[PDB]
């Protein structure tokens, strides 16, 4: 028996691609978006029946509609330039640790986990090498984990069966790095 | 929509607490929000507050707008309450688990609605109040929510942690477990 609760949500979205700025605007009751401005459309359009009293009344009022059309170049492109000076230039370097999942015998099967933490942005490349050869199979990746603090995290595991003298290398390619970063692990 | 980057102002209002929230996210990471009680702008990183600023009036005003259309929609919908979408919870460490080196435990509550929620950090059954922090109720593109909860800790082989979550879409409190080694 849940308590009484009504939720109203709003979203002002700027899409930056090439040199463009597409302004999306969403009006949302509970989890249902009913009214929306699309800059490629030029006017409000009701997504559901709930937003017909607004879409028609908000439209045909020129003072509102003109303000909304200029948004892509008034706050979207404006904010984007401010983001290119600070937010885009943020580059935090990935820290790499390598370890087996569990400790035990040598010739027994195990998982080598390459744990890459605290990097930004999220586009990262992790590769595995055994004795100089890329292991292209047996690679289990917990794809990109967002930490909620402007840093990403990923775990890339290799299905291994280590022999004495085998050398495993994890390679990491990130935009914050000039060259690939490697971390090594020998079976002993 | 094709885009190199997405820049989304996002805000919500509701009957229970949190009654309101206003923020701006860049590529799904919260850049800044507007403290509606202290009437201020709060930047997530010093990198941000050192550069630009935001009119805290622009958030408080959009909240009053959101509140005005909260009603007139309560009435228009014949008082429609939404289904309680239950949360999914994950607990994972911020850095590799080295015994001794201080770490941060992350509790990720995801895919829930409405944005009402209790979270408790339990160490060995007992709750932890010191050394904890949490993110905002972060909106998703499918208009549910997700939240982050943090606890700084020193990995001990004698310690055991739980993230206890309460939501109206759950029958009982949800306990998610994490353990060293």
């Amino acid at each position: 028996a849940t308590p009484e609760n009504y939720v109203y949500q709003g979203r002002q979205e700027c899409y930056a691609f090439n040199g463009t700025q597409r302004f999306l605007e969403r009006y949302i009751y509970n989890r249902e978006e009913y009214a929306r401005f699309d800059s490629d459309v030029g006017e409000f359009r009701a997504v559901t029946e709930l937003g017909r009293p607004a879409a028609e009344y908000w439209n045909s009022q020129k003072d509102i509609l003109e303000e909304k059309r200029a948004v892509p170049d008034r706050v979207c492109r404006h904010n984007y330039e401010l983001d290119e000076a600070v937010t885009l230039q943020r580059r935090v370097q990935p820290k790499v640790n390598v370890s087996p999942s569990k400790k035990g015998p040598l010739q027994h099967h195990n998982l080598l986990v390459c744990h890459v933490t605290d990097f930004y942005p999220g586009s990262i490349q992790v590769r595995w090498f055994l004795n100089g050869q890329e292991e292209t199979a047996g690679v289990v990746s917990t794809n990109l984990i967002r930490n909620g603090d402007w840093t990403f995290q990923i775990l890339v595991m290799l299905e291994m069966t280590p022999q004495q003298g085998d050398v495993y290398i994890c390679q990491v390619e990130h935009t914050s790095l000039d060259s690939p970063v490697t971390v090594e692990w020998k079976a002993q | 929509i094709k885009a190199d980057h997405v820049s989304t102002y996002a805000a919500f209002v509701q009957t229970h607490r949190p009654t309101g929230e206003f923020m701006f996210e860049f590529d799904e990471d919260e850049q800044f929000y507007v403290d509606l009680d202290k009437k201020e702008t709060v930047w997530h990183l010093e990198e941000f507050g050192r550069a630009f600023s935001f009119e805290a009036q622009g958030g408080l005003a959009n909240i009053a707008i959101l509140n005005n259309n909260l009603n007139t929609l309560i009435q228009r919908s014949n008082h429609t309450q939404a289904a309680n979408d239950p949360p999914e919870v994950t607990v994972f460490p911020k850095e590799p688990v080295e015994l001794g080196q201080p770490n941060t435990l992350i509790c990720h509550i995801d895919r829930f609605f409405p944005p009402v929620l209790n979270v408790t950090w339990l160490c060995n059954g007992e709750p932890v109040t010191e050394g904890v922090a949490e993110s905002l109720f972060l909106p998703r593109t499918d208009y549910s929510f997700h939240k982050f909860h943090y606890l700084t800790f020193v990995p001990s082989a004698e310690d055991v942690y739980d993230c206890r979550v309460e939501h109206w879409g759950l029958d009982q409190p949800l306990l998610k477990h994490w353990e060293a080694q």
Binding site: Y27, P53, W58, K68, L82 | F52, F54, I65, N69
Partner: peptide, 12 residues
């Protein structure tokens, strides 16, 4: 009836 959203921006 229903008010439109206000659009502000970050400023240096």
């Amino acid at each position: 009836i229903e008010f439109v959203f206000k659009n502000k921006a970050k400023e240096l």
